[PDB]
C-alpha cells in the first residue's frame with residue numbers, strides 16, 4: 001500500500017491539528033531553515049514506533065507543543081498515519097500522548113505496542129530494522145559502516161539473529177571454550193543443526209539482496225560499467241563475521257569505500273537501501289536530505305530511479321534543500337514558521353505536475 | 360516615482376505560476392514560504408492543493424514588485 005497522509009496534533013512545533021499531505025507517489029518536503037522540517041521527520045519516526053530518547057527530548061510530554069517552555073498547548077498530542085491499500089478501506093495507525101504515556105491505536109482501537117509493531121510488520125514496515133527511514137547526515141554511513149554492523153542488519157531483517165542465543169549455547173556444549181574442544185556425535189549434531197538453521201535464515205535474505213544489488217547499483221548509476229558486490233568475510237558462517245560491500249563506480253577505476261566522494265558513497269548507500277527493499281519491500285521510504293552530497297548528475301539519476309519506481313514498487317517522501325532534487329517530485333509540502341510563544345510550524349501543498357518540466 | 364507602485368489586496372500563487380515551468384513555479388512557491396517566515400505576507404490555503412493566497416503581513420518588505 002502507501003502512506004496517504006499524516007495527521008498531526010500539537011506535536012513539537014506542529015500546533016493544533018494539521019493534515020500533512022495527501023502524498024503523491026514522489027513528494028518532497030521543503031522549507032526555509034527553522035520552519036519545522038526536522039520536527040516533521042520526528043513525527044514520522046514517532047508514529048512508526050521510535051523510542052522517545054531518539055526524538056530529541058528528555059521526556060515524552062516534552063513532545064507536546066509548548067511543553068519545553070512550560071507552556072504546553074494541551075494534555076495530549078498525536079501523530080496518525082493513514083495507510084491505503086488497493087481493494088481495502090483506509091487503515092489508521094496512531095500514537096497518542098496521554099498522561100505522559102504513549103497509547104497506540106489501529107482504526108481508533110487501542111492496542112499494545114506488540115500488536116502495533118506486529119500489524120506494521122505485515123505491511124513491510126519493520127520498526128526495529130527501520131530500513132525505510134534515512135535520517136539527515138546518515139546516508140553515507142549506510143555504505144561506510146562497519147562490516148560487522150552490516151551483518152547485524154541482515155540478522156535483524158532475516159530473523160536469523162533470533163537463533164543466536166541457541167547457537168551460542170550449542171557451540172559451548174559442543175566444547176567451544178575448552179583447550180581442546182571435543183564433542184560427541186550428538187552435541188556436534190545439535191550444533192550443526194542450529195548452525196544450519198541460522199545459516200538458512202540468514203541466506204534466505206542475504207543471498208537475495210546480494211544477487212539483486214548489482215542491477216540496482218547499475219540502474220542508479222544508469223551505466224553498465226558500474227558494479228556492486230556484497231560478500232561475507234565468513235562464507236561458511238556469514239552471521240559470525242562482517243559483510244563486505246565494495247563498488248566500482250562507472251567510468252571509474254576501483255577504489256575502496258572510504259576513498260569515494262560523499263556523493264559516490266551516497267549512491268552506494270541507496271543501492272543497498274533499495275536492494276534490501278527487493279527482498280522485503282517497504283511501502284514507503286522517508287529520506288531526510290539524502291541529496292546533501294549529490295552533484296546535479298547524481299541528483300538526476302536518483303530522482304529518475306525514484307520516479308521510474310514510485311509508480312509500482314515504492315513511495316518516496318523526501319526532505320530536500322536542493323531545488324534540483326525537489327523540482328523532480330510530483331508535489332511539494334512546504335513548511336513555514338509562525339510567530340508565537342513557541343515556533344509554530346504549518347504546511348502548504350503544491351502540485352508540480354501542472355507545469356511542464358521544460359522550456 | 361516610487362509612490363506609484365501600487366498593488367493588489369491579494370496575490371494568487373496559481374495565477375503567478377500561469378505559463379511557468381516546474382522550476383519557476385517551485386521557486387515562487389518557495390518564495391512564499393520565505394516571505395511568510397519574514398512576516399511580509401499572510402498565507403491562506405483553503406484545503407490541500409487549493410490555490411495559495413498571499414495578503415500583506417505585519418512587517419514591511421521591500422522589492423515586492425519583483426517578488427510578485
Ligand SMILES: Nc1ncnc2c1ncn2[C@@H]1O[C@H](COP(=O)(O)OP(=O)(O)O)[C@@H](O)[C@H]1O
Pocket residue numbers: 011012013031032033034035036037038039040062063064065066067068335342343344
Ligand atoms: N515541543 C515543541 N513545542 C514548540 N516548539 C518546538 C517544540 N519542539 C521543537 N520546537 C521548535 O521547532 C523549531 C525547530 O524546528 P525544526 O524542525 O528543527 O526546523 P528545520 O526546518 O530547520 O528543520 C525550534 O524553534 C524548536 O524550538
Ligand SMILES: [Mg+2]
Pocket residue numbers: 034037038
Ligand atoms: Mg533541521
